[PDB]
């Protein structure tokens, strides 16, 4: 007496190309890699006429990359309660804080997103002045462009009058989270406004994809680069921001953000290379493929399907990218086709010749998308 | 096709009716249309608006910064803000005001 | 490449005159000094005709002095979580309470501001009767002047019909915190009323500074003394009281308090000495310089700038005072140029001639301004 | 240099006839005596054709009197945090529950007032079913008299259609506390209704005192006895009930309850013996003095003054009573002059013929007023 099931999409097991615990072991391997990244040459180090040398690639550093790194780790921790992830996060903060605060800018802000979540769980009082001080800075002192746009000011450059995709990930989202956390709705209002202004200036209505940068000095988008990683920051942020906002379904702002996300995801679907990866210039099939952008894309598309911001069929896109991502994780755990920190290009070639190399955000984004993919195993 | 005029001829009437009849759905729909029209018609390069847009070929026809077309926006935004009666710090209110300021800044020039 | 940054106020590091960790060591030293203060001669002991002898100088006593003492310690602890600070604070209450209660007056109230904060975090049920009994006494039994003003009654003197600056620190701020903490808006209303009435009787509209005291027994301000430490209580209390009230920006009372604060701070800027300190009579350059007032001022002005109660340019006033403070801290952690307990003067000489000796409030105010200064290092 | 203070009511030390710590040791001593009471004589063993042998004196029994006992100890524990007291309370419940539940009536309800407090603190889930079950009983199964009056059914008597003073303390107050704690307003409304109906049938408008009992069977007040201990339940219960209800000052029910309280205290202050104690028949001097009642009165008056339900000047009555209670506490820690379970008298001489014995309520009520008096030392 044996029941027929394999024939029915309703009755039959999921076709997991990779087993749950294999996934977890991969994430562990990817994490082990991250905390052990080393710039041997010292070739990648950020140097300022200050005398400051900032390690952007090694773990013991403080910049946006670590910001993304901590968030990817947090995601895993949040889902599974893995105390190994927790310790790595808390240790990074303790180590950096003992050293002393770095200077404030769009990028050094990123880690406060994760700190916000850690403060939320533990209520460690020692964290609160960090969060208040930096959010207050983002509100009131961070340089603004025309129309009160957040200026993408960096450790290294003023970038007068410029707005970048990356700002949405490194400062806006952290500001939103803190605003919710400390019950300061002004922070959240500011954050929403920044989203709308960024959309106004960076989205390419022509394609649904986004331009890397905008400048109010000349009102242009530089090379008009439809850069992969940058776009990725949006596929990541919109869903996380929406989840933060928790707005009713017919809310004009919710609907407007879902729309921006959709226009992008549709354009990305048509842009995906056979390998499940995306080109570093998304509309240039001859650019090298880039894994970290691909990972962010996987994450967002997965989450947007899960949350129903976009329809179910987009899963296939995610599924391909995820298979591709696993293919690109080396036996050491290094996400292979990662591009190094990328500034604003004044021509397309600039984006084409960015060096490839392992990075905190490379590893972290792999775990971001892989953690969202783990939800398929509940 | 999406045009400047629609904001005055249909959207503002919808919004007023939404407030009057206590039908917030109407107002949300209206607000959404404002955002989408800004997206497809406002010219970030100048602060002015293009006359029309089309999702059939994804373009702005002649990319005309047509005056009367633009004047509908100058009329509609202040009236729409008036109706919405939102706090000063509200992100949508700020956004709409920002668009208005961009346009008036360019008109004055 | 090396990026040019030193040339930009936005990109370059802060020029701290002192390191974060040196600043903390100073605080450690200053605290250590505080808890070890003794009066050998006995010359400073408060003596009463019922035989009570009360050490206003040593840590083992119970006076307004220890209250300020505790508040300063609490600020450093609240910011940093320092368990050494915490244990010193809790041992004082533990020791005093086992001794048994002192009599109730405007001054002996001061410690409960810190007790409230400790209760808020520990919810130790044994603290509740203390806060309730004492706050209730402030509400219903503490003597009132004409018009329901709080009479500055002390251990030693009735001061019939008198209102002083000091009341806002010693009793009113305590009452307000307890009001918020226990959900008793009546306590907060009484506190707000007291502020308004003190402003009415003590603020000098001609200068923006405050007279030390007022009496409804003759309707006069005694010697019309614009006394430094007296004024500094205002500079501390208004920002703390505003913060506690957490009122909307355009709230009339919030604005009115912000005006009061700005009027004072504008005046303080104009009469600050080249050294960073102020004169014990603020408007008398031939009066001696007084560090405790200066600390109080440093704190208030710093906090006011942080909270944006006043404009940023005031930061430089605060900076000059903080350097003055540091320069006035001995290697043994004592704050030099602290003036002794000061009553109501009937002439200006009374102020000009107050003795100089270390005091809990002196050390504590240093701690206070320094802790607020530390926020510049997040 | 000494300040003159001894002549001033505002400045001088409180004159305490007993020291705080002495008072605390007296409470511990009275407590120690309480939790050791026994009648190895079997003298008071309640007997039922049930075959039930119930011990009304011993601490290991379960009568209304333990309810009062637990309540006093809880007050002391609440005020001080004394773990010795907590353990005694917790153990009693653990032991009784292990033995198993007694039958439900007006008296066996009392201890659940204290249990509600312990559940509030501990959130011990094993306590909930007890609290819910007994409160549901009070609401839906406890016999009612005409007009829904809670009938005073005891362990061994129905008392058909009878309403007594005691019910307010033994069942109504516990119901109310449980109503607030479990967010069941119906419970609180029922309680409030019972207060009103009891006032109606028991309060004596001619004197301000209460009659011991009422009956809808013949519509009368039995002997019209103004029995002290009976009256003391009201002095205890009204302030505690007002405390729980936490109503605005202008609220009509709050005013009403306060009015009843004022009528009673006004009359008590008038008929208080010079010894500070009251007569067991309050309006008859030739009545013997009863200390347990006196304690009930001291607690209530002390609390009513504190909460300002009555004017401060009544503290004079309380103070006299408190001195009296203390003179009546043997070195063994026993409250002398304490009457036995007094029933419903059909004539006055009845009350003038009661047995006097140590009881969980005697010591209990002694520790109750003493604990409240302790608030005078903060």
């Amino acid at each position: 007496m044996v029941y027929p099931v394999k024939h029915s999409p309703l009755l039959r097991q999921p076709e997991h190309f990779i087993a749950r615990d294999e996934l977890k072991a991969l994430i562990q391997k990817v994490t082990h890699n991250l905390v052990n990244i080393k710039d041997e040459t010292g070739e990648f180090l950020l140097r300022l006429d200050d005398g400051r040398v900032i390690d952007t690639k090694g773990w013991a550093g403080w910049e946006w990359t670590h910001g993304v790194g901590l968030y990817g780790m947090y995601h895993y921790y949040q889902q599974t309660g893995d105390q190994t992830m927790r310790k790595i996060i808390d240790d990074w903060f303790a180590d950096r804080f003992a050293e002393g605060a770095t200077t404030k800018n769009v990028n050094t802000m990123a880690p406060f997103l994760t700190l916000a979540y850690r403060y939320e769980e533990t209520r460690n009082p020692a964290y609160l002045p960090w969060l208040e001080t930096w959010a207050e800075w983002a509100m009131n002192e961070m340089p603004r462009t025309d129309h009160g746009g957040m200026q993408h000011i960096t450790l290294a450059e003023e970038n007068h009058q410029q707005m970048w995709d990356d700002t949405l990930m490194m400062t806006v989202l952290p500001l939103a989270k803190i605003g919710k956390l400390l019950n300061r709705p002004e922070y959240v209002e500011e954050a929403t406004y920044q989203f709308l202004l960024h959309v106004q200036n960076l989205m390419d209505k022509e394609t649904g994809l986004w331009f890397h940068g905008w400048s109010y000095d000349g009102h242009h988008n530089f090379a008009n680069a439809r850069w992969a990683r940058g776009n990725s920051w949006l596929t990541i942020v919109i869903p996380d921001f929406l989840e933060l906002l928790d707005l009713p379904e017919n809310n004009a702002v919710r609907r407007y953000l879902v729309q921006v996300l959709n226009a992008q995801i549709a354009a990305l679907a048509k842009c995906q290379d056979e390998s499940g990866l995306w080109h570093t210039l998304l509309d240039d099939p001859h650019s090298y493929l880039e894994a970290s952008a691909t990972a962010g894309f996987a994450y967002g598309i997965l989450k947007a399907v899960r949350k129903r911001y976009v329809e179910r069929h987009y899963a296939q896109v995610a599924e391909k990218a995820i298979r591709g991502i696993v293919k690109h994780i080396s036996p050491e755990g290094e996400l292979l086709q990662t591009s190094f920190g990328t500034g604003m290009g004044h021509d397309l070639d600039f984006y084409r010749h960015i060096p490839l190399t392992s990075m905190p955000y490379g590893q972290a984004m792999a775990m971001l998308c892989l953690t969202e993919y783990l939800r398929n195993y509940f």
Side-chain angles (χ1 to χ4, degrees), chain A:
Chain A
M1 26 174 167
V2 186
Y3 295 79
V5 292
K6 191 189 183 62
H7 60 91
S8 154
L10 301 188
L11 291 179
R12 90 209 162 183
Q13 294 173 161
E15 188 249 329
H16 292 147
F17 76 97
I18 184 188
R20 186 188 62 182
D21 294 330
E22 199 167 23
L23 258 162
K24 294 193 175 173
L26 196 56
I27 298 172
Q28 303 299 342
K29 202 198 308 171
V30 166
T31 299
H32 184 259
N33 202 268
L34 200 176
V35 306
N36 284 120
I37 304 272
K38 190 157 103 79
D39 187 11
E40 312 285 355
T41 334
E43 157 191 2
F44 292 113
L45 302 164
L46 213 222
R47 342 187 75 107
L48 288 36
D49 67 1
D50 244 26
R52 288 186 280 167
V53 172
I54 298 100
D55 188 6
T56 256
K57 157 196 251 283
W59 190 229
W62 187 336
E63 203 201 32
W64 69 272
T65 62
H66 313 85
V68 175
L70 297 153
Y71 192 48
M73 289 183 186
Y74 180 73
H75 270 260
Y76 194 74
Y77 162 69
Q78 180 178 61
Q79 181 196 105
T80 72
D82 188 303
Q83 281 292 341
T84 300
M85 292 296 167
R86 190 222 36 90
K87 166 130 188 306
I88 292 173
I89 289 160
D90 295 353
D91 287 346
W92 189 92
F93 281 121
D95 292 347
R96 299 290 77 80
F97 287 169
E99 285 162 1
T102 186
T103 51
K104 298 191 186 70
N105 58 62
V106 69
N107 292 328
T108 59
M109 174 76 59
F112 295 100
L113 174 51
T114 300
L115 191 64
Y117 274 103
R118 292 295 294 135
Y119 176 68
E120 181 171 40
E121 318 172 61
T122 73
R123 299 290 153 175
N124 192 343
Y127 293 158
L128 180 61
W130 288 97
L131 300 168
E132 295 188 331
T133 307
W134 281 71
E136 273 301 297
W137 166 87
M139 286 292 287
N140 300 290
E141 304 192 44
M142 161 189 221
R144 302 292 210 264
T145 72
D146 290 11
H147 296 296
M150 289 193 159
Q151 178 171 300
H152 192 83
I153 185 178
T154 272
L155 274 163
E157 306 188 67
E158 280 191 19
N159 296 316
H160 195 61
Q161 291 285 40
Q162 298 181 26
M163 294 180 66
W164 301 16
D165 306 348
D166 308 65
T167 301
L168 287 160
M169 176 73 242
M170 314 315 165
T171 289
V172 187
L173 177 57
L175 174 63
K177 168 59 170 177
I178 297 184
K180 288 297 178 169
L181 178 56
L182 307 182
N183 297 309
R184 296 180 180 186
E186 303 81 350
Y187 295 177
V188 176
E189 280 319 279
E190 174 64 19
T192 303
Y193 176 79
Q194 288 302 326
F195 229 99
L196 299 171
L197 193 61
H198 277 73
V199 169
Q200 178 171 307
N201 286 337
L202 295 160
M203 178 192 171
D204 175 30
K205 60 187 161 162
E206 282 198 15
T207 66
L209 301 167
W210 283 47
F211 295 116
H212 184 201
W214 163 262
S215 178
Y216 274 117
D217 174 11
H219 298 69
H220 60 82
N221 289 101
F222 299 80
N224 291 9
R226 299 180 178 93
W227 175 55
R229 178 147 68 248
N231 274 265
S232 175
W233 295 136
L234 262 124
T235 329
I236 287 170
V237 167
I238 293 176
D240 284 11
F241 188 52
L242 283 180
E243 175 178 73
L244 259 175
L245 284 174
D246 194 18
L247 301 179
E249 186 174 8
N250 86 314
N251 173 282
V253 167
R254 186 189 184 286
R255 280 181 63 202
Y256 181 73
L257 294 181
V258 168
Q259 180 270 159
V260 168
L261 181 65
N262 257 268
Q264 190 193 54
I265 292 192
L268 282 161
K270 297 166 42 50
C271 243
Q272 193 176 26
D273 173 75
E274 172 175 292
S275 58
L277 265 72
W278 278 267
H279 301 276
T280 197
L281 261 359
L282 294 170
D283 60 337
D284 185 346
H286 84 50
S287 334
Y288 56 80
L289 301 169
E290 203 285 318
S292 66
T294 301
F297 286 151
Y299 172 79
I301 297 176
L302 278 172
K303 192 174 181 157
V305 167
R306 160 162 72 102
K307 295 302 197 75
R308 298 147 120 256
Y309 305 147
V310 315
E311 296 152 328
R312 293 274 162 192
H313 66 80
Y314 279 119
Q316 289 162 294
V317 167
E319 173 72 18
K320 302 189 182 175
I322 287 296
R323 281 163 192 241
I325 291 297
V326 169
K327 257 51 85 194
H328 283 70
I329 302 184
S330 96
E332 288 54 71
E334 166 182 16
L335 187 58
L336 289 178
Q337 291 268 294
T338 304
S339 68
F340 180 63
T342 299
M344 182 70 46
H346 293 259
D347 56 27
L348 267 168
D349 275 347
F350 166 96
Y351 290 92
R352 293 173 178 121
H353 309 119
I354 299 290
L356 301 163
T357 189
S358 57
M359 300 286 277
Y361 57 84
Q363 309 304 116
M365 292 156 92
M367 62 196 99
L368 262 184
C369 67
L370 291 175
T371 298
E372 175 65 35
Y373 193 71
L374 268 178
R375 288 186 75 82
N376 284 339
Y377 297 70
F378 295 105

